[PDB]
């Protein structure tokens, strides 16, 4: 799976260990281990959100399998969770657009996961 | 609604008031209030078009719904429009990707719109 | 087609030349004409893939066509081998999302490729 997140929220106000903790929380959360969890933080950005430049974020989880209606309102309400308590962004800022790729669309060590 | 645009026109040619154009704009293109638009600019970047390195930008316009072919068309009159305005740069070095997202498979406070 | 690699390889040591080699090999892969090529680096983000922030990178090729499982393959092995010989990153550590757009959800030219 991977996990990117951009956002206006300022690089220093990222807390050391944050990559560490969304790698860990989301192989508990999908089920996959550690070693295939990419995860990707843009702080810095130029973003509004309802025409507001206050804290939000645009992100993504991109997943072969375990995407689904359940499973989203799970991931949106660990990830929202986790953006509201490290970096201090309302989770009424927040989009987070899932995707269920298929295996063959997925390249990775000079081939596919086909 | 989510509209990104990543280009290597520099920061300073991104003018005053932008992303509240392209909110209000993307507003009632979609049909949705400006609440629930995002929009994010990536200027600065590393890109070529046409093995050009000339001003270019690639899009990306995720919605729930309101994607299809007049629709995506009339987007990219405008989208084009816009950036060829605001940007200089030419809308023949603009690809805009449309995503039509399942309202399950988009997350906000805390929850998905399913 | 359009191929965006982001990386937490610093700016530095993207070699001169990299986004005219993507250009051509991509041209050559895809066997669309360079002129509809489109390329872009992003160096320098906070990323981590498997638990590790050793070099990696999160990749996506889009494409009008000429997406499948063979074809993503070849695309794979050319992609990370670009990425191992010029970047440094080992191909285990890279992701490459695959996404064949059909032509009405492709802006360009204050139109789309319908
Ligand atoms: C971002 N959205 C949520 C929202 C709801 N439905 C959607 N439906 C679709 N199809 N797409 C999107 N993006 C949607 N987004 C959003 C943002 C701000 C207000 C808002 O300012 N509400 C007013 C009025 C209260 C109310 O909405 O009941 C307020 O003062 O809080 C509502 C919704």
Redesign the interface.
């Known amino acids: 799976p ?1 996990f ?1 997140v ?1 956002t206006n929220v300022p ?1 220093a106000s ?1 807390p050391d260990g944050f ?2 903790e969304l ?1 860990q929380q989301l192989a508990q959360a999908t089920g996959k281990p ?10 810095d ?7 507001s ?1 206050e804290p ?1 974020a ?2 993504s989880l ?1 997943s072969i399998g375990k ?3 359940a499973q ?2 799970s ?3 660990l ?3 986790l953006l509201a308590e490290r970096l201090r962004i309302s ?2 800022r ?8 298929n295996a ?9 996961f ?1």
């Open positions: 991977m990117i951009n690089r990222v990559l560490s790698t550690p070693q295939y969890i990419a995860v990707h933080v843009v702080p950005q130029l973003m509004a959100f309802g025409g430049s939000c645009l992100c991109h995407i689904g209606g989203n309102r991931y949106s309400k990830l929202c969770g989770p009424d927040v989009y987070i657009n899932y995707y269920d790729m063959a669309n997925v390249g990775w060590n000079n081939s596919t086909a």
